[PDB]
Every structure is written in structure tokens, then in C-alpha cells.
């Protein structure tokens, strides 16, 4: 299960492979992974689906209550809440959550929280098991403040490699484009992207 989030001019586009695997068996290939914990802060999930869910459901309650009593949650602020649970449950749970958000004020922002728990703000981020293959690809093809049309194209391509060399990665690349416009879901099948 490779996952990524990549900044562009108008914001951030999250993409993700949709499989949930038990062993070499594909347990489910239409599983949902780009999961709404708040309106324009959405997150990519890797690791044990169970562990991460537990974290994500606790935080989702926090951010609603945060917004009403203490006004809008920042991406940085929200990453902090996630970071506390991760840090204390570093041994107990293995959870790798890319929490990514779009503020109209601060455009696309990416925070990666690794298994040990820490807020690390980065331009763009790659996680899951396929990240490695496309570490070298992605670095070379990093453009700043990309055109929207390209950004979609770029993610499709990166993940396309991942799926050929690692069987876990696979299924539909679902995306949520978080820009000033709102939340737009896109869906791309291997028929469209695998050839390219």
C-alpha cells in the first residue's frame, strides 16, 4: 500500500492505492483509504488498518470540537494532536499517517508522521512500501508550484512504477484534490495509468 501527497500551485493533491491485503491474498481491492477527518484536512493511511483507524477516529472527534470551541484547526495544530497519540503508542501500535491539508491561506502543506511520531513539514512526501522505487524518480521531477493538469499526471506515473515492482501496491488510484474550490474526488483505473 503505497500512498503519497504532492503540492501544486493551487494547493495539494493526495493520491493513494486502494488495496488492503492479507498476506499475498488481496483481501479487498476497493477499500477506502483517503479518509475525512475534517473538511480540508484529509489523510493517507499505511500500516495496520486497525491501529491507524483507532488514532484517526479519536482525532476526528477532536477536530470537530477544536473547530467549534477554539476556531479552525491548523494543519500544524492538527498534526500535533495526531503526533501525541503516535508518540505514546509508538511501540504499542505501528501507524504511519500522512496528514495533509490545504489552507486557502497557506496553500498545500504536507506533514508526515512516522511510526515513532513527529511533525515534519515537507514540500511533498511518499510512504508505504513502494515509496522506495520512486524516491529517485520523484526527486528529479520535482517542479515548483506545478500546473494542476501536470500534477495529476505526475502522481499517476510515480505510482504506476510502484505497482509493477510491488504487488501490495495496486488498485485504483483515488485522489482528492484539495484546492480553494473544495474537495474533488478523482478516480483512475489501471486501464488509464498502467500503460503510461
Amino acid at each position: 500500500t503505497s500512498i503519497m501527497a504532492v503540492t501544486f500551485k493551487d494547493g495539494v493533491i493526495l493520491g493513494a492505492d486502494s488495496r488492503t491485503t492479507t498476506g499475498a491474498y488481496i483481501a479487498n481491492r476497493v477499500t477506502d483509504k483517503l479518509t475525512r477527518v475534517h473538511d480540508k484536512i484529509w489523510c493517507c493511511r499505511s500500516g495496520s488498518a486497525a491501529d491507524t483507524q483507532a488514532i484517526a477516529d479519536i482525532v476526528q472527534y477532536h477536530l470537530e470540537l477544536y473547530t467549534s470551541q477554539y476556531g479552525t484547526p491548523s494543519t500544524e495544530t492538527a498534526a500535533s494532536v495526531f503526533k501525541e497519540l503516535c508518540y505514546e503508542n509508538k511501540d504499542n501500535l505501528t501507524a504511519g499517517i500522512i496528514v495533509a491539508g490545504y489552507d486557502d491561506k497557506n496553500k498545500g502543506e504536507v506533514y508526515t508522521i512516522p511510526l515513532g511520531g513527529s511533525v515534519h513539514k515537507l514540500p511533498y512526501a511518499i510512504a508505504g512500501s513502494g515509496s522506495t522505487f520512486i524516491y529517485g524518480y520523484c526527486d528529479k521531477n520535482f517542479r515548483e508550484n506545478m500546473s494542476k493538469e501536470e500534477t495529476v499526471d505526475f502522481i499517476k506515473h510515480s505510482l504506476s512504477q510502484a505497482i509493477k515492482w510491488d504487488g501490495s501496491s495496486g488498485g485504483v488510484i483515488r485522489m482528492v484534490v484539495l484546492t480553494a474550490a473544495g474537495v474533488e474526488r478523482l478516480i483512475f483505473y489501471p486501464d488509464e495509468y498502467e500503460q503510461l
Binding site: 476497493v30 488498518a49 483507532a54 477516529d57
Partner: protein, 226 residues
Amino acid sequence: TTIVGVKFNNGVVIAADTRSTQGPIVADKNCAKLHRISPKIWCAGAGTAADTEAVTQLIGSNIELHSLYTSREPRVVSALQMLKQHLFKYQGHIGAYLIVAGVDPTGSHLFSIHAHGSTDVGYYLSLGSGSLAAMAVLESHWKQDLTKEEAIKLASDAIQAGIWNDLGSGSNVDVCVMEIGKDAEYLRNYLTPNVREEKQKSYKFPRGTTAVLKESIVNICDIQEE
């Protein structure tokens, strides 16, 4: 252990075989997998029998309480959360694995829960040792918008396949057809493959074949009033 669920427009059908085994010894030739959370939300249990039983009772009381308080039958999405949060607590020591299916006003729903609180969503699923075998029937013949008739026959088919290749799968299939806003039609023992052939030669023995040491007479009735 073979359990399948398949959606249709008018509901969801979930079926399972009732051959249950404890070790390679067939413990029971009928032991319904199928538990009741609520009269339109039924689920089947995999893993250990004791594990599924204990849990199904706990959550089925919980939903009941919730159902009264809110005077509306809760969502199938309530029941998924409820299972999940409990099992998380024991950290998966208690390993209960269910297919949870139900109908409610929101619509028709199909979910999975496992030991450590892993879930899967999907139009069609299957679970247990013979899950692999059932999934196989299901990927070839699935179709957008299965009809009641088509989905029931397909679900029972998948079980029959499971019977043959997976040997903890045998005996009669119980089917619960759960239709939205209408009483669940239990088609108990929809397919029975079994055959029983009595003993060819009678094994009854005349009386006092067996040796006795001494006999006694005892009572459990309360002692006499007088």
C-alpha cells in the same frame, strides 16, 4: 468455515454452512453461525465459537438499549463502530471475526470486522478457511445490480463450492434473506446435500445382555408433607 455475503437491490443475503467442528472431529452437524444483533441486522461468526457468542450477546444488548432510547432502529454503521471499539480494547486477544450485514432505512450495508479491529467494505465479501474458495465463485459471476433471485442462488452456489474443497464446510446451509422494511425470511436449510443411510444390520440387543452389580432407586422430589 465458509460464509458469504452478497448485495441485491431489495436487501442483502448472507448465508453460511452449519457443519461446525472442534478439531478434526466434527463436533456438530448443525450449529448455526448466524447470530441476531437485531431483527434486520444478522451476522455470522468465524474464528472460535465461544468468541463469537460472547461478543454477539454483548453488542446485541447494547444496540437494543440504543434502539429504545432513540425510538428508531439504529444504523448498520452504528453496529460497525460498536464492534470495532470493543475488540480494540482487548487488543485482539479475543479474536472474533464477523461478517456483519443488515438492512436499515439508510439502505443495505456490508462490512467486515476482525480480531484487532481491521475492517473491509465492499459490495461482496467472504470469510473463513474456505473464503478463498468462495471468492472464486463470486468474481466470475458477479454483476452490477444483482436481483434478489440471482444473488440468493449465487450465494448458496458459493457455499456448495466451499463444501467440496473445504472439509470444515459440509452439511446444511442456512440462509437469512434480509429485505429492507420487511420481516427477514429465514430459508433454513435451503440446500441440504446430506444423505443418511441407517445401519444395514440391526444393532439392537435383547435386554439383560449387560451385566449389573446392584441397582438402587433415588428421588429428587421434595420430601413428603406427612
